[PDB]
Amino acid sequence: TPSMEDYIEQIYMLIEEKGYARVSDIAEALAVHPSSVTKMVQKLDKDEYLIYGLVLTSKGKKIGKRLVYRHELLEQFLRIIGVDEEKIYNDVEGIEHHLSWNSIDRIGDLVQYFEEDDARKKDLKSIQKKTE
């Protein structure tokens, strides 16, 4: 499931970025072999996420948009609570697949909480100082 999610998220991004998604671009972006991509694409095709360049069905597009959103939100989350920027991508890449929608939605409210009043960010930063 996680792997399928990484493929769909990547395909969505490529289509939005280049207008198309090639097996070759998919393979490179995911650091995998084209044989693994072809196999995965056939599975996604079977499950109706896309059609074998390759075009996403409405189902793959809705899921892709959501996966990209999930990624972006999780990066903002760690960024806001002060995680070293260089560590953020790798952590989001691992946890993004293991968070229920309830957790994603709650994390979304947390981000909004800190975004609607900068004093709150200042208050959270102060705690980091005490901890130090």
Name the minimum Å distance from CB 71 to Ca ion: 4
- Among a copy of itself, Ca ion, none, the one that 6 touches (CB under a kind-dependent 5 to 8 A) is Ca ion
**For residues 35 and 103, which CB has a smaller minimum distance to a copy of itself in the complex?**
103
Nearer to Ca ion, 41 or 73 (CB): 73
- Of the two residues 15 and 78, which places its CB atom closer to a copy of itself in the complex? 78
Least distance (Å) between residue 105 CB and a copy of itself = 7
Helix (H) or strand (E) segment spanning residue 78? helix 58-80
Binding site for Ca ion (CB under 5 A): 6, 71, 93
Q: What are the CB-based long-range contacts (under 8 Å, 24+) for 53-56? A: 53/20, 53/21, 53/22, 54/11, 54/20, 54/21, 54/23, 55/15, 56/8, 56/11, 56/12, 56/15
Secondary structure class of 49 (helix, strand, coil): coil
Give the CA radius of gyration of the chain: 18
What's the min distance (Å) between Cβ of 79 and a copy of itself?
10
Residues near a copy of itself (CB under 8 A): 78, 81-84, 87, 90-91, 93-95, 97-100, 102-103, 105-110, 112-113, 116, 120, 123-124, 127-128, 130-131
Residue list for the binding site = 6, 9, 71, 93, 96-97
Residues in contact with 40: Cβ distance below 8 Å, sequence separation at least 6, in sequence order:
3, 4, 7
